[PDB]
Design a protein around this ligand. Structure first.
Ligand SMILES: Nc1ncnc2c1ncn2[C@@H]1O[C@H](COP(=O)(O)OP(=O)(O)O)[C@@H](O)[C@H]1O
Ligand SMILES: Nc1ncnc2c1ncn2[C@@H]1O[C@H](COP(=O)(O)OP(=O)(O)O)[C@@H](O)[C@H]1O
Ligand SMILES: Nc1ncnc2c1ncn2[C@@H]1O[C@H](COP(=O)(O)OP(=O)(O)O)[C@@H](O)[C@H]1O
Ligand SMILES: Nc1ncnc2c1ncn2[C@@H]1O[C@H](COP(=O)(O)OP(=O)(O)O)[C@@H](O)[C@H]1O
Lengths: 574, 313, 200
């Protein structure tokens, strides 16, 4: 007892005082472990599982089963000791110290005979006192473990089992695997219901059953870098901590779990208040604050985001996938910029990928990285990593028709299931991101021309996965008048920072409108008209210090009937 | 230990294995040939009467888009393991480049990522009994099939690290989209597969299955199948939806097109029911504790219904 | 304290003399850190932030909050020590010296219980001294982090996180990411107004 205690911790006395958490739902794996230790030769199981499933929890539950007495006679009255390799290695300046300590431990185990050894993180045994080919813990344990005279229990994750143990086939032979599979949703709910009491006592808060059901569902659905039941426990524990901080008896509901998840991952799953609800209902006007015209596209996107925010989106598919195909300059990109501004408050959050560069057969690997064995393997994908930074995003694929079919064959993955496997092998989540595909093709009859061009330039499946195909309409006179108003407002807002005030009469706005209309319009022209007839004149006029700072500038027009072409009209800057 | 299901067939398991054709028909409407072939393969595998060298099953699936080729594999995984996420899904859409194939089995020694190993081989070693799905196999280059060439016949793959993995107990499924009256389509699909793939690869596969186009009965049952998802989603918010049969008829009328598969129907449902119900929910017109009876007015049930709308109660 | 002063620096004692710059406008991140540090199991936050944003600034603000006493009861009068891994593995020359120093540090922390660790460049835990016969500090720390018996705070670049901690999922599990994003323009102006007195 005195020898093992300085080099290990006894889980039996830990479960005597209840210091270990109760373990429930693990009868199959614990029975598997108990039946492996009841063998004659090679009675050593190692718990292989994905990290965060309960590999140490299985051993704690077995210790509780031992101390209660549900074990058979082969595991009855057995003190389960974990072994700390760090305590063995530390303090050993010399060969004799470490090997003497390990063999004294083994002699005490074989003398008392009722200590089952536990090696958490079993991959540490390949090299303890020296390298893999010298005298260490593994080469001392191997003759003992081969005959089964030393009962030990291991725990190693999947990847480290592949890496460290499997390169040492001698230890791989002597350990019989016990797979601890990831628990289900109902299993996680049961586990949380079991662990209610400890967290309730610790955080001085009370937790409801609906809170735990919501925690399990949200943790399984959204968080895709951790594994059940750890993420559900994380959400519950963090909500309890939030209540403990905020009160300094509180209640935890699913709303607080949603808040914790929103803090953790940024996914906008919240209980909607009145102000954001009226914002969501009236957001078509909010988008129409910036974009002018094109009611169909804003309507479709409003429908998609309203469906997403109300919990009515198919969870295996993204929030929405759109093809914005229409004549150049209409505002296909500006709709995406307006979406970014609405959803995040800033426009730099729009992950914009340009398909102009992806015209070669070698550049498809930029999105999802390079395969193993090639240059760029560690960096991985550019798009996948950008998505992993923030799971809720608007992904913009600008100028689709430039890129050729290999990228779309890559993107059928995300268009169907919202998954993408980068070069490093990891799968990333796209179940919440909004996909926008902007195209410049086909330039009521324009609708059919664009549809025919897209059917000719695409395979049927890629057009089929897309939620809504939206064809942008050409602009009219009222829309370009409002565009002129918006551009002048932008100029005035930029000029506010230089101690200025700017204003235009409606005659100047009309004159700008009459010189900015043709079927090849958009905002690429009629903004060049602004830069040529307003901005340039203002710059040259303020460079030689007339109507400088503190002076309101009024842009007027003379020699114009207000209806004519206005080619002889000139802008006057008072 | 290994998870490979060799046991004594209990009566419940036996009567399930006799009746698993309609169990597959629970999630797939129509496509009797593919369900037939999958049932034959699973019956051969679980009876203990199987070729030791060849894999459990090797199928190539062909048909139009959205005829349930991936849905069949997902429902087969749901049958065997209980959930879709146990399906080992490798989509060949990322493997267009010839240099990309090293991700499948792994990096050779002396190169970066050698210690990481492959992706397909390691996931097969994790679960030796698995349904391996290869989506859109034509979109990968032809040199990628060369790695699968020997697992399709001998069921063994040699990774970069040198280990030999066992593909003997897995069900290999290929899904294609080539070819896009039934016999003419089958002949065209077979000819396209023959001229697209080398004949030494087509001979090593078990059955070539062509998916039949969806008919009116199939899509009108599939209306129910895909609205059950919305009903279950609504059940999480303490409110229920029941469709009038007129709503089902109108949804099946506006979502049917022989040119494509099932996703036009999902578009029709999503635009007619999901979006409008989202507006009604966020307006708080309807909430928890109520029922929603969706009905079609201004319609006769036979006409095309270019003016019919949906009423929500 | 006799062993930690040889290997670490006391930020609470540093905040006693006000040698740390005032931290302005980072109340949300400090609240998130105190939220994570208040948990029962896995109470280790990592400040996942781009370089140049103030990852260490968040920790010094937390130390100033602790010394000013506005923290909740679960962080009241707890000395926040930064852990200098270079000094821990500085004089070893052997196989058992570094692990002995780590055991002494952890035993002093356990017998005190009011000391929170801070690890600049948290990715240095993996491979924190790995000779032919040595066990790195990550494998020592992992059982204590999983049970929640040790409160550690980490600061790590996004890219460094992805290169190093992402490769080790066992240690990645024990740390909750805390997104520290770039301050906006107005936030930068507020920070400059805070730092006016010191720079003047
Ligand atoms: N059946 C269960 N009952 C109670 N708690 C559980 C159960 N399964 C898992 N847990 C919790 O999840 C955690 C699992 O940790 P574990 O997976 O052993 O870590 P590692 O993967 O590093 O070995 C434990 O802290 C435990 O509290
Ligand atoms: N209706 C509009 N409202 C506001 N800005 C617009 C509008 N239409 C165009 N713009 C501006 O003009 C640009 C046109 O972009 P876009 O239509 O995407 O060009 P293209 O169609 O050639 O890709 C946008 O970046 C936007 O700033
Ligand atoms: N017969 C069917 N029964 C139910 N759903 C179907 C059926 N056919 C297609 N689907 C729908 O189509 C999608 C799968 O289509 P898929 O088989 O992947 O087509 P492809 O393989 O050509 O891409 C699923 O989301 C499913 O909802
Ligand atoms: N909110 C803030 N208030 C005051 N100073 C800040 C704030 N945020 C950042 N700083 C300044 O930024 C610097 C911190 O950078 P640091 O986090 O050390 O970068 P890195 O961790 O990459 O070395 C400090 O000098 C600090 O003064």
């Amino acid at each position: 007892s005195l020898v093992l205690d300085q080099f290990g911790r006894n889980l039996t006395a830990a479960a005597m005082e209840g210091k270990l958490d109760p373990v429930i739902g693990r009868e199959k794996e614990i029975e598997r472990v108990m039946q492996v230790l009841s063998r004659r030769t090679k009675n050593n199981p190692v718990l292989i599982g994905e990290p965060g499933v309960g590999k140490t929890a299985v051993v704690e539950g077995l210790a509780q089963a031992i101390v209660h007495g549900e074990v058979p006679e082969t595991l009855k009255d057995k003190q389960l000791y974990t072994l700390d390799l760090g305590s063995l290695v530390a303090g050993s300046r010399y060969r004799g110290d470490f090997e003497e300590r390990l063999k004294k431990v083994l002699k005490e185990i074989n003398t008392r005979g009722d200590i089952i050894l536990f090696i958490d993180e079993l991959h540490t045994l390949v090299g303890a006192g020296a390298a893999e080919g010298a005298i260490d813990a593994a080469s001392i344990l191997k003759p003992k473990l081969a005959r089964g005279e030393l009962q030990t229990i291991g725990a190693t994750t999947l990847d480290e089992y592949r890496k460290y143990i499997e390169k040492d086939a001698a230890l791989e032979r002597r350990f019989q695997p016990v797979q601890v599979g990831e628990p289900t949703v109902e299993h996680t709910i049961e586990i949380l219901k079991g662990l209610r009491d400890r967290y309730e006592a610790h955080h001085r808060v009370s937790i409801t059953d609906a809170a735990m059901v919501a925690a399990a569902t949200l943790a399984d659905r959204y968080i895709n870098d951790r594994f059940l039941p750890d993420k559900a426990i994380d959400l519950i524990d963090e909500a309890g901590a939030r209540m403990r901080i905020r009160r300094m008896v509180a209640e935890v509901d699913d709303e607080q779990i949603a808040e914790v998840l929103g803090n953790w991952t940024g996914i906008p799953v919240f209980k909607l208040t009145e102000a954001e609800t009226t914002r969501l209902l009236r957001m078509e006007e909010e988008l129409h604050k910036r974009i002018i015209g094109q009611e169909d596209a804003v309507k479709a996107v409003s429908k998609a985001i309203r469906r997403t925010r109300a919990g009515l989106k198919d969870p295996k598919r993204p929030s929405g996938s759109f093809i914005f195909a229409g004549p150049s300059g209409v505002g296909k990109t500006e709709l995406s910029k307006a979406l970014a501004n609405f959803l995040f408050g800033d426009d730099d959050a729009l992950i914009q990928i340009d398909m102009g560069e992806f015209h070669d057969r070698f550049t498809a690997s930029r999105l999802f990285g390079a395969p193993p064995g090639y240059v760029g393997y560690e960096e991985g994908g550019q798009l996948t990593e950008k998505v992993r930074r923030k799971p809720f995003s608007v992904v913009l694929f600008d100028e689709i028709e430039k890129a050729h079919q290999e990228i779309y064959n890559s993107l059928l993955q995300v268009l169907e299931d919202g998954r993408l496997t980068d070069g490093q092998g990891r799968t990333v989540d796209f179940k919440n991101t909004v996909l926008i595909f902007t195209s410049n093709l086909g330039t009521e009859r324009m609708k059919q021309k664009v549809n025919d061009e897209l059917k000719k330039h695409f395979r049927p499946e890629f057009l089929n996965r897309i939620d809504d195909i939206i064809v942008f309409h050409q602009l009219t006179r009222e829309e370009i008048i409002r565009m002129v108003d918006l551009m002048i407002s932008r100029v005035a807002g930029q000029l506010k920072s230089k101690d200025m005030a700017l204003v235009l009469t409606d005659a100047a706005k009309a004159l700008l409108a009459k010189r900015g209309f043709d079927p090849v319009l958009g905002a690429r022209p009629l903004r060049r008209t602004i830069q040529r007839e307003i901005e340039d004149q203002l710059s040259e006029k303020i460079l030689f210090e007339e109507v400088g700072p503190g002076q309101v500038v009024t842009v007027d027009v003379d020699n114009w009937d207000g209806e004519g072409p206005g080619e002889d009209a000139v802008f006057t800057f008072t | 230990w290994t998870g490979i299901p060799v046991f004594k067939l209990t009566e419940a398991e036996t009567t399930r294995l006799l009746r698993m054709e309609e169990e597959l028909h629970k999630r797939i409407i129509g496509q009797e040939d593919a369900v037939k072939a999958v049932s034959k393969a699973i019956r051969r595998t679980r009876a203990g009467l199987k070729d030791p060298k060849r894999p459990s099953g090797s199928f190539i699936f062909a048909g139009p888009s959205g005829v349930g080729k991936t849905e069949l594999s997902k429902a087969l995984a749901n049958f065997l393991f209980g959930d879709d996420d146990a399906l080992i899904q490798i989509d060949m859409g990322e493997f267009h480049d010839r240099f990309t194939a090293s991700r499948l089995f792994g990096a050779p020694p002396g190169y970066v990522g050698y210690e990481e190993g492959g992706q397909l081989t390691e996931k097969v070693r994790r679960k030796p009994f698995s349904v391996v799905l290869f989506d859109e196999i034509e979109k990968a280059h032809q040199e990628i099939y060369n790695s699968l060439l020997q697992v399709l016949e001998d069921g063994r793959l040699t990774d970069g690290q040198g280990r030999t993995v066992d593909f003997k107990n897995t069900v290999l499924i290929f899904t294609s989209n080539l070819g896009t009256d039934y016999e003419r389509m089958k002949q065209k699909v077979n000819d396209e597969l023959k001229k697209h793939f080398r004949p030494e690869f087509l001979n090593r596969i078990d059955d070539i299955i062509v998916f039949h186009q969806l008919t009116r009965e199939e899509i009108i049952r599939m209306v129910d199948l895909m609205i059950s998802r919305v009903a279950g989603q609504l059940k999480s918010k303490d409110m229920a939806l029941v469709l009038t049969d007129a709503a089902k008829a109108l949804l099946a009328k506006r979502g049917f097109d022989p040119v494509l598969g099932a996703r036009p129907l999902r578009r029709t449902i999503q635009r007619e029911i999901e979006d409008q119900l989202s507006e009604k929910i966020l307006f708080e017109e309807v909430g928890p504790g109520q029922v929603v009876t969706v009905d079609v007015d201004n319609w006769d049930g036979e006409g095309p219904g270019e003016d019919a709308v949906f009423t929500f109660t």
